[PDB]
A paper describes a structure:
Many malaria vaccine candidates, like RTS,S, are based on [name] [name] ([name]), which is the primary surface antigen of [name] sporozoites, the stage of malaria parasites infectious to humans. The structure of [name] comprises three domains: (1) a flexible N-terminus, which contains a heparin sulfate binding site for hepatocyte attachment; (2) a central repeat region composed of 25 to 40 major (NANP) repeats, which are interspersed by a few, N-terminal minor repeats (NVDP, NPDP); and (3) a small, structured C-terminal domain. Cryo-electron microscopy (cryo-EM) reveals a remarkable spectrum of helical antibody-[name] structures stabilized by homotypic interactions between tightly packed fragments antigen binding (Fabs), many of which correlate with somatic hypermutation. In each complex, CSP displays some form of helical structure that is stabilized by homotypic interfaces between tightly packed Fabs bound along the length of the NPNA repeats.
Each of the extended helices in complexes with 337, 334, 311, 356, and 239 are right-handed, while the partial, disc-like helices of 364 and 227 display left-handed curvature. T28 is a germline residue that is nearly strictly conserved (S28 in 337), while the S31N mutation is seen in four of the seven mAbs: 239, 311, 334, and 356. Other key residues in CDRH1B are R30 and F32, which in both mAbs 239 and 356 form a signature motif R30N31F25, mutated from the germline sequence of S30S31Y25. As previously shown for 311, the tight helical packing in the complexes of mAbs 334, 337, and 356 creates a secondary homotypic interface between Fabs separated by about one helical turn (3 or 4 NPNA2 epitopes). To create both 239R and 356R constructs, the RNF motif in CDRH1 was mutated to germline, along with the same E64K mutation in HFR3 (R30S, N31S, F32Y, E64K). The light chains of 239R and 356R had one and two additional mutations, respectively (239R: R56T; 356R: Q1E, R27Q). In terms of NPNA4, the apparent affinity of 311R was essentially unchanged relative to 311, while 356R and 239R were ~two-fold higher (improved) and ~two-fold lower than 356 and 239, respectively. Strikingly, however, 311R, 239R, and 356R each showed a consistent and dramatic reduction in percent inhibition relative to their WT counterparts, which was statistically significant in each case (Mann–Whitney U test; p < 0.001). While there is a range in the level of inhibition, many antibodies are highly potent and have statistically indistinguishable protection relative to mAb 317, namely mAbs 356, 311, 334, and 364.
Residue numbers in the entry:
A (entry chain N), B (entry chain X), C (entry chain L), D (entry chain R), E (entry chain D), F (entry chain P), ...: 1 to 94, 96 to 107
J (entry chain I): 1 to 88
K (entry chain H), L (entry chain Q), M (entry chain C), N (entry chain A), O (entry chain O), P (entry chain E), ...: 1 to 52, 52A, 53 to 82, 82A, 82B, 82C, 83 to 100, 100A, ...
Write the structure that this text describes.
Amino acid sequence: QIVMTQSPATVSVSPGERATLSCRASRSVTSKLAWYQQKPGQAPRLLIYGASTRATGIPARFSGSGSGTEFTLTISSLQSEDFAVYFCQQYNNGFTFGPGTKVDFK
Amino acid sequence: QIVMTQSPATVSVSPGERATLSCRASRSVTSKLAWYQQKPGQAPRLLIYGASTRATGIPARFSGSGSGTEFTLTISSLQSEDFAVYFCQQYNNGFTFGPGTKVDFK
Amino acid sequence: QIVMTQSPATVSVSPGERATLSCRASRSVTSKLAWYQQKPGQAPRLLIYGASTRATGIPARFSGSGSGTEFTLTISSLQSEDFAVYFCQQYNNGFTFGPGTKVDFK
Amino acid sequence: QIVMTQSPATVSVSPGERATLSCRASRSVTSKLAWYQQKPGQAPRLLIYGASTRATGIPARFSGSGSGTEFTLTISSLQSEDFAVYFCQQYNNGFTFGPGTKVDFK
Amino acid sequence: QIVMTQSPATVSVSPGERATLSCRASRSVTSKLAWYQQKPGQAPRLLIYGASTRATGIPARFSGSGSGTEFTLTISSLQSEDFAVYFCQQYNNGFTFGPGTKVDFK
Amino acid sequence: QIVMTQSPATVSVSPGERATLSCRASRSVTSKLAWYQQKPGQAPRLLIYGASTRATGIPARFSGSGSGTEFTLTISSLQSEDFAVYFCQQYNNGFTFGPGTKVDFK
Amino acid sequence: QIVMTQSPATVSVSPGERATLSCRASRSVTSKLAWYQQKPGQAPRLLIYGASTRATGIPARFSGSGSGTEFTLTISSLQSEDFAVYFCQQYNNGFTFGPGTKVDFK
Amino acid sequence: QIVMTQSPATVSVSPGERATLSCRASRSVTSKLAWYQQKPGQAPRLLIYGASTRATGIPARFSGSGSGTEFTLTISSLQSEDFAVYFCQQYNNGFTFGPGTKVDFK
Amino acid sequence: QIVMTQSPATVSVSPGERATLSCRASRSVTSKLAWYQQKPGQAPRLLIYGASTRATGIPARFSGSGSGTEFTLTISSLQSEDFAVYFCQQYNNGFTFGPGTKVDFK
Amino acid sequence: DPNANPNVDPNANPNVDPNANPNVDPNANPNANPNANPNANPNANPNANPNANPNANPNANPNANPNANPNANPNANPNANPNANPNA
Amino acid sequence: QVQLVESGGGVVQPGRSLRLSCAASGFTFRNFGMHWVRQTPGKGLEWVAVIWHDGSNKFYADSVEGRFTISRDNSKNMIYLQMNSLRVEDTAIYYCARDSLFYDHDNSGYYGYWGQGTLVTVSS
Amino acid sequence: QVQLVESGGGVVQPGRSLRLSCAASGFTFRNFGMHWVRQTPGKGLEWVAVIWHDGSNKFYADSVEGRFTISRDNSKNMIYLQMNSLRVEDTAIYYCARDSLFYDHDNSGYYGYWGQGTLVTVSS
Amino acid sequence: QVQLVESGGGVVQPGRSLRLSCAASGFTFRNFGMHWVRQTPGKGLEWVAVIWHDGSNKFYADSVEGRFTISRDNSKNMIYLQMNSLRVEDTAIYYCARDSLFYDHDNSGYYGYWGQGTLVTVSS
Amino acid sequence: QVQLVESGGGVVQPGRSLRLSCAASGFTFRNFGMHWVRQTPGKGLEWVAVIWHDGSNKFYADSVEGRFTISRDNSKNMIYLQMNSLRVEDTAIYYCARDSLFYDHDNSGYYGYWGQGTLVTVSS
Amino acid sequence: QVQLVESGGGVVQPGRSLRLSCAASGFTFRNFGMHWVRQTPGKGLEWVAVIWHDGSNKFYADSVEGRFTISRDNSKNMIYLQMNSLRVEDTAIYYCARDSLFYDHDNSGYYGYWGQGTLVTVSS
Amino acid sequence: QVQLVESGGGVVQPGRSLRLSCAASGFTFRNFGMHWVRQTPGKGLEWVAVIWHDGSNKFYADSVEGRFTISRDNSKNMIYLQMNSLRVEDTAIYYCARDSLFYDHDNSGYYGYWGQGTLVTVSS
Amino acid sequence: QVQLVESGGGVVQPGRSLRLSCAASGFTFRNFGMHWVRQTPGKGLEWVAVIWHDGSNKFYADSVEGRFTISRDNSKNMIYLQMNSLRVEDTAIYYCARDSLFYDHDNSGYYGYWGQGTLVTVSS
């Protein structure tokens, strides 16, 4: 169905700075796109659902935006616990995940 | 077992009109419910047995009806010699009586 | 629930002519609508049921048709005994009746 | 209830030739439809029940199929004893029979 | 909407001759125009649809051509059964018919 | 689900004039929107249900209107007992309430 | 048959506080569930029979409830004598008991 | 009633390996399906009843599962005495058995 | 609906060469077009779907491209097994197949 | 464009489009709908159903019920039966 | 010959209770559900209550919810309607009606066979 | 060997009463429900009545509702049909038909085994 | 064999209502949209109305806007045209016609098949 | 007989909100788009807003952009115009008028049928 | 006369369980679905749970999902709400609300009739 | 392993009826829509019919419109094609084909999986 | 506290079968649909299957269509996944994921709550 791509593969940022992750879809998924955060040894956790709506318990640090085929996830001021690999899913047509973007120390 | 409740406790009426007496049971009694009339000073008299059958000698003025959990006693043209307290009994499960209701002059 | 209206309020047709009675529902009733005929002092009589099916004993003179929110009852060659008030009922959602339409001599 | 119609009324077939019979329902019947075979002077015999299940003792020659409002009875190689009138019954809503289709010598 | 006129009103052609029928629209109908054949006592029949395509069962004798506001219909070899009146319809904008051109024996 | 907002927070009108309260939904709720009135120390009371239909016993003063994402509650000529808080509910998707609007003496 | 379970195993409640016990069924037992109280060295005592009815001589302090698969027992203001182990029985299908919940000092 | 099928007819597993057997029903069976183990010259032995409940005396090695029309029986680590033919029964509608699956040495 | 044509009818290429098959539509079919390979005695097999996407299991040798009214199928280096008749289908408007282009030995 | 035609075009295709996807959508909501009507339906069929199975059900439990009431019944008739056989 | 006759009519004061009874004959009573239908001059026909074949379910109109009670006795072929807390708006003619001409699973809720009706007037 | 033998047929005048009897053998009678089926030339086969296994429930067709009474007695393996108020439309051959070949919960209402049939003629 | 037959014609007075019916067979009725065509001698052929496949959309000619109502039912394969407030301009032969011979998404609105036509005259 | 009736008129104070309703009958309402027309003495006719056949696209005039809201209910055949934050410049006669007499793709935006109009006065 | 009265209110500590009960009278209890609605000052009105007429389906709000439990007993005309694992966010007045004024298939989910409300305080 | 097997082929006479069955296994049957494809030598492949996942919609080709009936039963996982009034032009091999390899909303209508096919020939 | 705990993992050989189980607690299980999500190192996350709230509809991915069977038991709050005919491509971590944080009609298909995961390896 719809292939999901994320770029860049790895983002290097030091704590306190803003880190932006991007997600792209081959075909338009309107505004049905969820972001997940996975730490090593842990199951993915739902951060954002829809296009920008934030899951309960998630701090206002995480901010997502975009519609159609261009999606971005923005961490306003990345803390120590925000170092992980983030996956991009669209549920408009089927259920396809992105390869995943890893955020690491600088 | 089965608890009988009568409403209203007392009714006010003048001779010649129609009086309605209600009996309600907590659980289903099918069609086994008897009505008794007790005047001050002597024992209650069986008016109606079953659900509507009248005892031998009871005038057709006394009319009973109902089944299950709702029962009523209706007197077509209430007379003077019959002012008394009326009791409701169920004999399907155990043997319980109602609190009794009174007909009084208005 | 569904508000039922009839038009016109009264019809004037000579015997042997064709008289058309219309019925309208506020919301869609699919194909669940019956027609009743009431003569003065008599209980209503079921002529057509569902949308068009005819009750047993109803002459082929009576023809019901329609679906949705537009129903009509057509009397091809109205005789002397067909002068009465006709009621339109829906039973798709609840049980509501129309105001009734009277057929009168011309 | 359900109006059952069979077509054609009579089919002309020779022994060894495959004969087919059709049955139609006014409304949906799903998969509850039985076929009966009546020979002159004899009571009907249950050949098929459900939509295709064959009664015990019925040769595999008889094949039924269909669902909803289209049911067919197919005789693969009609023999000499297979000349009779076949009835179509539904037992989904009520119990109504079809007019019956007769197979005869060609 | 679009005004359709046909000229000439009547044509006189002997059997075996070619007949030319003209249809003109007030405004452009692109390539959406059908031709119809009507015989006395019969319903109109579809000969050519689109701008040139021929309906199934219609012989290749009938050939239509043209686009925009000028359309023509030609019968290459008129037979005995082709004597009738021909109507012109446009269905690009609304649904309008032409007055009709009659084919008469010469 | 759908977040409902009401504007203005408070509206000041003297008895006798016209008061309008507006309700807006984030996503379309079609025509499923009920209004409630709550007096200090009392439970809310259903005034208008659907989009305009009035509950039994509600005076014709309270007039509801609107559909989709823009709704209004109109009071024709306000009395003294109509001073309360009015809530806006949508029941098309989930069950959410508005913040409430105060009407107070001017 | 039916496996009875209680949670939590032990509850710590100081005198004058409200204590709640839970009993859960694998399958529905309607409203046939009795509660028992056992003090060390003594036989269990029937507190509640049915779903909420109280045994004769049981103080109105003990208030139980529940139906289906979720049952609870509430002690309104636990005294010094209410320190014991409470068992849950169902008699709808077979006769099975619960593991027992102990109430101890805090 | 229900035709009961098992697949495959024969399974070959070495001791210590896991053997799984499948049972399929023509129609819905819900959670009424039993498994029986028959050794040569012996009567069948009830292993599982319901859909997963284990008969008394059967070791926790045997684990039944499934519901509806798909049922599976799993032997976690088969020993030497677990070589036999396993029959699948449904008792939801009538009493039908399966053909039987044999477990053999590899 | 849409007539599908291919050219040339037959292509002669020795193994190891490149063979190109062309498909042309009367009207635009956008990017909905499938290529099928049929070997003698075998059912057609889906090679490419959409305009370029390859069915699972198809080697990267087959490459489809084109859109609108001009399509092509390229076999970069045919083996012996790639010799068959290829059909061009459009499913944008209706379901029509091409006449078929055969690839044979040179 | 404010000057676009607001009226419906009657020349639109009235036939069902066969190219619509015949596969069932996996993106349909799998959650139960809380907005469904919770009230009982008065428009259900109040008549009895002759299509119910008239045959005796062999799947009923044949085992004796232990949950039957073991206490004696005080509501049994205390009067001597006149219909008992009076012969020898 | 399905004949439905009702009784229990008369004149009652507002706030009092009246009981209507309806005798059914000519059909298998326990296989069908019966309705009560209200006719008031100037308002037309109105539905009141319905009961199932075995009396399992009972549905009443909004204007009579909580005041009227429908019941049936399949052993005596009788239909009853207890009307407590009567109000002046309840003056009407009450008809005993049977649901449907015959069993049709997808078509029920019309009153094929009616009774003659009784008049109930509430006034002082 | 399921064998059904009808009886009680003959000729009667319109408006009179005729009672049909059906004797069953070769199966457990009390476990199954029995039907009555009517065959009139020119119209075809017609269903009449059905009775449950224990006789609890009885259902009738519209044309025979309130006039025909079906009954069963499991101690004699007999099926009865009481026909009151007979009309000229009731002349036919009446078949005793058992419901279903074997017990299937989701498939019932077909007549696996029919009787020989009896002729009931109504005229003057 | 796409066969379209009309009915419901006859003679009616001005200002009354007439209902025409159209029975279609030989094709999947629910998959196609149907039309009504009017033939007035001295004027030619005149289009009346078109209905969608499922009845979602209905369109009417300007001369009949607000007076004519077209409707369909897919369970009986029949087409209805309700004609209210008939005028002396409405005398003609009315044809039931199907849209297109087959489905072409860019080509629709021509009448592939026609019915024999029913004659409707309004006069005094 | 295209009949359009306007309501919701009266006198309101500046800064408040009024609602106008326009009932349409005599034509297929859901197949056409309606307008709102303003007539001010000393100025002439002024366009207010336009709505699509299903309300998908709405266009307003500059003098009322962002303040007036147009809506429609095809199930009730009514046209609404919500005028929020009214000013003294908004006092005029408001007309509910349908777009075009009949459908023509290249000709739309002229007014074929007008309503009698309602008066809305904004003053202190 | 529909009256809804709640009980079981009071003050509890966080992490403990409370049981609210609601008594219903004046209507056929078993024919309607009941709701629990929450009112916290400073937040507004809030929905909690809903139960079907026979208790087949139960739906809870997100904030209470997994902790609260709604039940009913149609034989006692009472509505319950088990509040397990209470937190300080649950301090509010809890109303017993009935769905709809009457039965309408396409219009349900609005709270026609409310109870007086009970106060639940969670604190130490 | 998507395995499709046709059956019910043979030789019939013109004007008679033939039925083809298709047993599908190896995938969730009720989730996908199936087709019938006809291969006539000298003409190529031509489409016959399509049916939805749940059997709601059915579309046929022009050449077989009204003569062929497609149907399915999701319980036995079979696709049926009833061929009434066969003609000489209907001699070919019939294939049972599945639509799409997997679900895609914007891409459907291609046959991802074909059956081996069955031969149907008509003659005298 | 939505807690999901998987089990049933281990080692399998290619061509054999494994049955995974999922225990759900902390929410109303029967009101929500559940998914299965597979994580392969070097490939990422990919969806496997989904089931409806009542188990009516089941959808599988392309790579697992026909081999994997999803089931659910609302009476035990358990989610199953039968994995027949395993291949080396199926070696990964399988997560039990619940659909949606709360019910939204237009927003469903994201995994609100995940389980800890179970390891299934396919090797010899």
